[PDB]
Amino acid sequence: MTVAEDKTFQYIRQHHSNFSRIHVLEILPYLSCLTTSDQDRLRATYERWGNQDTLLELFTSLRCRNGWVHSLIGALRACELSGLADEVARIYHS
């Protein structure tokens, strides 16, 4: 990852409680950096382990993927979390 991506990832880890509001199933179809195999894996993960544990798995999966920060920003806006999107963007460019 880039300096920007790492910095963004740490912001996310540090604001666990804000990001925990994300509904995994709702956000997945918007995350274009995930492959369809990635999405299948993550849905099956949700079914078994529920939203919170899957969120953790979702973020560590994301940062293994090219351009995940922008993928996440777009998805957050689509999931009525445009405020989180704006903070993620600001950190990434900070």
Author numbering: 1 to 94
Text of the article:
The positively charged residues R37 in the 3rd helix (H3), R64 and R65 in the loop between the 4th and 5th helices (H4 and H5) from the CARD in a lower layer (purple in Figure 2B) are in close proximity to the negatively charged residues D23 in the loop between the 1st and 2nd helices (H1b and H2) and E26 in the 2nd helix (H2) of another CARD molecule (cyan in Figure 2B) in the upper layer. As an alternative verification of the key residues for MAVS CARD self-association, we searched for mutants that disrupt the CARD polymerization in E. coli. Our screen recognized multiple sites that are important for CARD oligomerization. Biochemical analysis confirmed that most mutants from the screen were expressed as soluble proteins, and eluted as homogenous monomers in gel-filtration chromatography. Almost all the mutations out of the solubility screen are conserved and at the protein surface.
Recognition of viral RNAs by RLRs leads to the activation of mitochondrial antiviral signaling protein (MAVS; also known as IPS1, VISA and CARDIF). Activated MAVS triggers rapid production of type I interferons and proinflammatory cytokines.
